[PDB]
Design a protein around this nucleic acid. Structure first.
Ligand SMILES: [Cl-]
Ligand SMILES: [Cl-]
Ligand SMILES: [Mn+2]
Ligand SMILES: [Mn+2]
Ligand SMILES: [Mn+2]
Ligand SMILES: [Mn+2]
Ligand SMILES: [Mn+2]
Ligand SMILES: [Mn+2]
Ligand SMILES: [Mn+2]
Ligand SMILES: [Mn+2]
Lengths: 92, 104, 97, 78, 92, 105, 79, 96
DNA sequence: TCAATATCCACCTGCAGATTCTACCAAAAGTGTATTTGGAAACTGCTCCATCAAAAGGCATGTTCAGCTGAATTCAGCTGAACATGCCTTTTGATGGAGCAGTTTCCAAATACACTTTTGGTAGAATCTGCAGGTGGATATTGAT
DNA sequence: ATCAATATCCACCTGCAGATTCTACCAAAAGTGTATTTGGAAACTGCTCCATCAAAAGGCATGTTCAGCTGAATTCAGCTGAACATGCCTTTTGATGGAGCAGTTTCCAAATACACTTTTGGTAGAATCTGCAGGTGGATATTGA
C-alpha cells in the first residue's frame, strides 16, 4: 500500500559493503535521493523527446539526459553502466 | 525471469517502466529505457553507499547514518556538484575553519 | 587561575559544532514561531510533527550556510567579525533578497 | 515569538558556520532573515495544503515548498 | 508552417496603447515570454495533479499554480482575471 | 459558430492553449476551464508587460517598442522583475545605475 | 589561439556597462578565463543537444536549451 | 591643452554604455573563439549565425552582471577598484 | 622557551531501543495474443552556411605622464568574548479526546473519442512608413583659477 | 563661485529596410453525438494532533572585566586612467556552391491494449545487535611566567 526504494538499496548496500548496515533515517535519505535523480533523468529525457517531435522516451533519451545532468567523470561511468546493462538485456 | 535479472541489475526494471509510463513524461516508453535508467540509479546509489560505508568505518562505526552520507557527498568533488542544492537532514557540515581565523 | 583568551573558546566551539549534527535552536520556541506565522496565512491549521521537523532542518541549514557566506564577506573586508552589512551583501549576491 | 530565537542559539548556528566573532547587531538581523524564510516556505506549503482541501500541513507539503524555492530536502520523502 | 503568438500579442498591444507598434525582434521576445510563462504554469499544474493522485488538470490546478509561481500582487490580478474568464465562458 | 475565446472574452487562443496542454504531457485528461483560465492569465501578463513597455517607448519618444523597452519595463517593475529574474532579454541592455560611492564630491 | 581576441579595451566596456569605474590589470586575464569556462559549459551542452538530434549544425535553439539548463533562460531566439 | 581628471571620463563611459544595448565584444574574434572551443568538443561542426548570436548575447549579459557583483564586493571592502579577489568572491556566492 | 592545569582522545563494557530477519496476502509485474503506430530509410528540392576577394575606416596597441588609489603603519576606545550565579522555560512522558484523514462504495457530470463542417492563422506578396544617419543650433560638462 | 573650450542633447531632414497590410489556401478548431472515466458525496474507522499537567533539569539571562579588534587616521610608490599616434584587422558586402536540412513516403519493428497467470514486496509481528556512554588512562591544548 505504500512503495519505496528501500529493499533495492539494501541489496546494493550488501554488494559494496557486506558487513555494513544502514539506519532508517539514512535510508529515507537514500530514498529521497533515488526519487530525486529519477525525476531529474526522467524530466530531461521528457524534454529531449518533445524538442525533437518524438513521442517515445528510449534508452537514447536517457543516455543523452545523463550526459547533460551528471558531472563529467560521473557521467562517463553511468553511461558505461547503462549501456552495459541494456546490451546484456538484449542477449536474453 | 525477472527483467531485473535479465539485465544484471538490482533495481527493479519493472517498477521503473511503470513510473515512466504513469509519469506524464511521454505517451510511449521504449523497452530499454527503464533498464537503462534503473542501471544509472543503481550506479549512483552504489557509489554513494561505497563512500558512506567507508566514511562510517573511518569513524569505526558499522552502521550508515546520515552524517556518513553527508560527509561522503560533500567530500566528493563531483557528487557535491550534483547535489549542491540539496540539504541532507541531520548531516551537519564538513569540518572547515578559515585559515585567517587561526591563531599565530 | 586561568582564563580563555578571547577567540580561543569560539574556535573550540566551531570545532565542536561542525563535528555535530543535532538541531541547534530550541524546539519549542521554534514550533511556536512556525505556528504563529502560519496562523497569519490561515487559522486553525494543524501540523504533522514531521512537518515542523522538516521546516526546522531546512531553516537551520539555510541559516548555517548563510553564516558560511557572511563569514566570507567579513574576511574579504579584512575583518574577523561578522556584521549586518556582511549578511546583506551575502544575501544580495545569492539573488535571495 | 521571534524573540524566542535566542542569542546563544544563533551563536551556535554561526559557529557551525565557522564564524569566530559576531557583531551584536547580527542577532536581530538573523531573526529577520529567518522570519522571511519561514514566511515564504510556510506560505507555499500551506498553498499546497489548501489545494488538497486538507487542514493539516504534512511533511511532504513542506518538502514540495522547499523544492519550489530550489532547496531540495532529503529525509522526509523526496 | 510555424505557429506563434504574434497576432494575439499584437491585438493586446492595440488594446493598451492603440497608436503604438512593435519591432519584430521585440515581438520575438514577447513570444518567448508567453512560452516561458505557459511552461512554468503548466508544469507546476502537472506536478500538483501528480501529488494529489489526480489525473486531470483542471482550472483549479491552474489557479493554484499561478498562486505559487507569480509574485504577490501580480498573482492577485491574474487570479481575478482567470476566474472572471471561466465563469464568463461557462455561461456560453 | 462562436470561438471558444470569444465566449471567454479573450484575445489569446483558448483552443491552442487547450491543444498544447493535451499534447504537452502534463496530465492524462484536461479540464474544460483549464485552458480558458490559462489563456486569460497568459493574456493578462502580456497586457502588463506591453503597457509598461509602451510607456517607456514614449519616454524615449519612439512609437515602436524595441527590446530595450521591454528590458526597461521589467527591470523597473518590482514584481515583473522577480518573475523574470533569471531571464535575459537579447539586445535589451541594463538599467542606468551608478553606486553612490563612485560619484564626485 | 583566439582567447586573446577578447581585448582589454572590450572587457572595459563590459565593465563600464557593469558600473565599474576603476580596474586592476589582473582583471583582464581573470575575465578571459571566466568567459572561456562559461562558453565551454554552454557549448558542450548545446552540442549534446545537437548530436542528439543527429545534426551537424548547432542551431540557435540548441543554445537556448543549453542555457535554460544552466538556469539562464534567454529571450529573442525562440522563433 | 585641457584634460580629464582620472575617473571623470570613466564615469562618462558608464553612463554611455548603460544607455546602449549593442554587443560590446567584437563579433569576429568572438566567433573565432566559439568555433575553437567547439572543435575541441567535436569536429566538423557548424553554427547557425544566430546560434553564435545567442551565445554572444548570453556571454556578455553574464559578464556584465558579474562585473556588477564584482563591483559590489569591491565597495564592500571600501575600495573603488575591482580586483581578482573581488571576482572570486562574487562567483563563490553565485553557485559558481 | 618551558611546566601545571585541564581537556579531549583511546580503549573498554552489557542492553534498550532499533534494526534485522521471518511469515502471509494483495497488487503489481509478467505473459499471450492482437493491433496499432511512430519514426528510420531512402530520396530530395532548397535553405543557409561556409568562404573569398578586398577595400577602407574604426578600433586596438603601445608609450608617456600625472594624480590619486590602495596598501601599509600606528594607536585608542570600546565592543564583544569568557565566566559564573541563579532561576525559568524547556523537555519529557503519560493521558484523553476530538477532528481529521484515509478507505470504499457508488452514480452524475465531466472528458475523451470519432467524424463532419467551418474558419482562422500562416505564408508570401504587395504596401506603407517610422527611424537611421547626417546637420545645425542650444545647453550641459568640466577643468582652470 | 565666474569662465572659455568642448561634448552632448534635441529636432529636423530624407530615402528605405523592415513593419503592417492584404490575399488566397489548409491545417485545425468547433460542432454533434456517443462511450468512458473520475473524482466526489456518504459513511465509517482509526490515527494522529492538540492540549494539559507536572516534574526535574539543563540552558538562558544578567552581570562583571578586559583583551584585542575595529575604525580612524597619515603618507607614498607605483598603479591605473587619460591622451596620442601608429598600424593592424574587423567589418562590409555581394556572390556562389554545396552540405546538410526538412519534407514526403513507405513500411516493419517496436510498443500498446487486454485478458490471465505468477511472483514479488509490504506489513505486522517474531527474533536480534550496535553503540552509547560511563569509567579514567596516555596525549593535546592553553596560558601563565
Ligand atoms: Cl584602505
Ligand atoms: Cl570642477
Ligand atoms: Mn529503448
Ligand atoms: Mn532557541
Ligand atoms: Mn471519534
Ligand atoms: Mn538619429
Ligand atoms: Mn555649415
Ligand atoms: Mn553638429
Ligand atoms: Mn535608411
Ligand atoms: Mn557576577
Amino acid at each position: 500500500r505504500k512503495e519505496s526504494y528501500s529493499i533495492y538499496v539494501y541489496k546494493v548496500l550488501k554488494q559494496v559493503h557486506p558487513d555494513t548496515g544502514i539506519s532508517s533515517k539514512a535510508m529515507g535519505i537514500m530514498n529521497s535521493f533515488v526519487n530525486d535523480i529519477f525525476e531529474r533523468i526522467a524530466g530531461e529525457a521528457s524534454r529531449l523527446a518533445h524538442y525533437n517531435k518524438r513521442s517515445t522516451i528510449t534508452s537514447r533519451e536517457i543516455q543523452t539526459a545523463v550526459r547533460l545532468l551528471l558531472p563529467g567523470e560521473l557521467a562517463k561511468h553511468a553511461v558505461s553502466e547503462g549501456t552495459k546493462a541494456v546490451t546484456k538485456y538484449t542477449s536474453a | 525471469k525477472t527483467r531485473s535479472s535479465r539485465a544484471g541489475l538490482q533495481f527493479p526494471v519493472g517498477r521503473v517502466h511503470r513510473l515512466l509510463r504513469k509519469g506524464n513524461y511521454s505517451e510511449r516508453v521504449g523497452a530499454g529505457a527503464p533498464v537503462y535508467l534503473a542501471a544509472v540509479l543503481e550506479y549512483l546509489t552504489a557509489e554513494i553507499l561505497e563512500l558512506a560505508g567507508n566514511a562510517a568505518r573511518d569513524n569505526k562505526k558499522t552502521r550508515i547514518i546520515p552524517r556518513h552520507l553527508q560527509l561522503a557527498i560533500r567530500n566528493d568533488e563531483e557528487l557535491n556538484k550534483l547535489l549542491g542544492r540539496v540539504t541532507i537532514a541531520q548531516g551537519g557540515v564538513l569540518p572547515n575553519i578559515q585559515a585567517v581565523l587561526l591563531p599565530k | 587561575p586561568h582564563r580563555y583568551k578571547p577567540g580561543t573558546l569560539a574556535l573550540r566551539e566551531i570545532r565542536k559544532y561542525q563535528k555535530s549534527t543535532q538541531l541547534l535552536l530550541r524546539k519549542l520556541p521554534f514550533q511556536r514561531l512556525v505556528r504563529e506565522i502560519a496562523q497569519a496565512i490561515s487559522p486553525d491549521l494543524r501540523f504533522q510533527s514531521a512537518a515542523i521537523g522538516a521546516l526546522q532542518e531546512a531553516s537551520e541549514a539555510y541559516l548555517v550556510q548563510l553564516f558560511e557566506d557572511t563569514n566570507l564577506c567579513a574576511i574579504h573586508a579584512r575583518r574577523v567579525t561578522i556584521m549586518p552589512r556582511d549578511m546583506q551583501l551575502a544575501r544580495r549576491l545569492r539573488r535571495e533578497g | 515569538n521571534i524573540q524566542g530565537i535566542t542569542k546563544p542559539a544563533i551563536r551556535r548556528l554561526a559557529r557551525r558556520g565557522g564564524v569566530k566573532r559576531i557583531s551584536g547587531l547580527i542577532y536581530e538581523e538573523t531573526r529577520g532573515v529567518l522570519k522571511v524564510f519561514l514566511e515564504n516556505v510556510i506560505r507555499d506549503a500551506v498553498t499546497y495544503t489548501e489545494h488538497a482541501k486538507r487542514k493539516t500541513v504534512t511533511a511532504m507539503d513542506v518538502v514540495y515548498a522547499l523544492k519550489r524555492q530550489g532547496r531540495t530536502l532529503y529525509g522526509f520523502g523526496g
